[PDB]
Structure formats: structure tokens, C-alpha cells
């Protein structure tokens, strides 16, 4: 019954049960190494570990870097221990996360922010190496201390950048958590309105939008419906560009320039 964790300089309340070994669980308090994600039972043991631990960032390859923001690609097979610890840590904040131990079939995309002591964990998403259903995200998490600052949408944007470069369309693995659904709705909205703002033509197929954005046709239609931009006039379906939504976006996109909370495709260095 873990209530709290000490993670670097933060003290975080947990949301859900995670299956940590019982003799850790019963303390109700875990001390975590912020770099290798090893869990320990006291401050003093943590302090001892930090003196020995060489890790200043996630394992795997740094495939994105824009200044202090990185994304590391970590192979569940090559770095089993790290990926399990990450999954156990994630399940403290995920209601729905199934698995924690069998991480070999998964890639983990771990987003970090650098300061003078190292590259600190912001969040991550996991991805099946080979998904039967072409899911481009399995679970996604922003660490609580970083929530609602724009990092989540950057992680989501990053998941779709990978899909674009793979020349696939993608979708998050069902089921979507409540906060998952909200974040994805905000992102889908943003990219759909951006597309329609830039697009000059007289008509588009859902297919064409999906091809550009890597977003799944169903998710596009779902968003069009959400914004009440699908209509039916004289026996055919029309995309209705709402002026309120247009004006709202250019306003929201005027503050997106000075935000710095943006994934920049030119800062990716990756091949599947």
C-alpha cells in the first residue's frame, strides 16, 4: 500500500496500486533512484546508491535532442531491469496498465529534461515492437510533477512523428484512460484544425488527412464529430470549417510560438 515516493527532489503521492514486492509495499514509502529507477526502502540507502550509480540518463539511444529536452529509445530486451522499474513506477499512476514484467516485446520512449546534475525523467510511452493492431502507443505517462505543462502533448506528438517516419498510421492502444482521452482529444483537435487552416483545396478525404498526420481515420472522424464539423446537407457529408474554432486556434497557435513546448521534426535522429 505505497502512498508516496521520493523521486529526486520531489515527493509524489501515488494514485493506484503497483505490484512492488511486499516488504517494500508495506513501508508505504519507496525511495527511487531518479536515473536507473531502482527502488530502495530509506533515504540513507538511497544516498549510498547515488554515490555508486553511474547513470545520468536513461539507457538506449538518444533519438531526439532539442537543447535540454531528449527522447531515449530503450529496448525492453536489452534493458529489462530499467524497463520493469519504469513499468512498476508507471502503474502507480495508471489504472489500466496490464503488464510490468514481460517488457522484452516493447520499446520505451523516455523523455528527459537536462539540468546540471543530469537528464531527469519527464515521462514516457511504451510501444510494441510489432503490434498486430498498429498501435503506436501502448501506455503513456507524464510524471505528476510535470503534468499539465505541455509535455504530454509533446510525447503524443512524438509518437505520431515516429509513425510518419515508419510510413504508418497509428492510434493509442485501447482502452484509453480518462486523462488519456482528453490529451489525445486536445492534440487531434490541434492537428486537424492546423491541417484545415493550411489546406487550400475544395475537398479532402479522411484518408488524405490520415496520410499527412499519421492519425487514424476513425480518430479524425471522431474529432470532426467532437468539433461538430461533420454535416449532412442535400444528401452528402460536408466538412464545415467553424469560424469560432478557426479564430480560437490561431489564438492558441499564437502562444504556441513562445511556448517552447514543441517537438521539432528536424531534431529527430532515427531509423526504425
Amino acid at each position: 500500500m505505497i502512498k508516496t515516493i521520493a523521486f529526486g527532489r520531489y515527493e509524489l503521492d501515488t494514485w493506484y496500486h503497483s505490484p512492488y514486492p511486499e516488504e517494500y509495499a508495506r513501508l508505504g514509502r519507496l525511495y527511487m533512484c531518479e536515473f536507473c529507477l531502482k527502488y530502495m526502502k530509506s533515504q540513507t540507502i538511497l544516498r549510498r546508491h547515488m554515490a555508486k550509480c553511474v547513470w545520468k540518463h536513461p539507457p538506449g539511444d538518444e533519438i531526439y535532442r532539442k537543447g535540454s529536452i531528449s527522447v531515449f529509445e530503450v529496448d525492453g530486451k536489452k534493458n529489462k531491469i530499467y524497463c520493469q522499474n519504469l513499468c512498476l513506477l508507471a502503474k502507480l499512476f495508471l489504472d489500466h496498465k496490464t503488464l510490468y514484467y514481460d517488457v522484452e516485446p516493447f520499446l520505451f520512449y523516455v523523455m528527459t529534461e537536462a539540468d546540471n546534475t543530469g537528464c531527469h525523467l519527464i515521462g514516457y510511452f511504451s510501444k510494441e515492437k510489432n503490434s498486430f493492431l498498429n498501435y503506436n502507443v501502448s501506455c503513456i505517462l507524464t510524471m505528476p510533477q510535470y503534468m499539465r505543462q505541455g509535455y504530454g502533448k509533446m510525447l503524443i506528438d512524438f509518437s505520431y512523428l515516429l509513425s510518419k517516419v515508419e510510413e504508418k498510421v497509428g492510434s493509442p492502444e485501447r482502452p484509453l484512460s480518462d486523462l488519456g482521452l482528453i490529451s489525445y482529444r486536445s492534440y487531434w483537435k490541434e492537428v486537424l484544425l492546423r491541417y484545415l487552416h493550411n489546406f487550400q483545396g475544395k475537398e479532402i478525404s479522411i484518408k488524405e488527412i490520415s496520410q499527412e498526420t499519421a492519425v487514424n481515420p476513425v480518430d479524425i472522424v471522431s474529432t470532426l464529430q467532437a468539433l461538430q464539423m461533420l454535416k449532412y446537407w442535400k444528401g452528402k457529408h460536408l466538412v464545415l470549417k467553424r469560424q469560432d474554432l478557426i479564430d480560437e486556434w490561431i489564438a492558441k497557435e499564437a502562444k504556441r510560438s513562445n511556448s517552447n513546448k514543441t517537438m521539432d521534426p528536424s531534431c529527430l535522429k532515427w531509423t526504425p
Partner: peptide, 27 residues
């Protein structure tokens, strides 16, 4: 390559491949 949706009380079936017209809020 279809989808089902309810728009203002009606129920509709929409193709993914068919181009749909873009309107700029007219009658």
C-alpha cells in the same frame, strides 16, 4: 472503409476515401 455517426438526430455512414466538400459556414 466506413464509419457510423449521429449528426443532429439522424444517423450517417461516411467513407474514408471519398472526398468531402469544405464549406465556410453558408446556407
Amino acid at each position: 472503409g466506413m464509419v457510423e455517426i449521429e449528426i443532429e438526430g439522424r444517423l450517417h455512414r461516411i467513407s474514408i476515401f471519398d472526398p468531402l466538400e469544405i464549406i465556410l459556414e453558408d446556407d
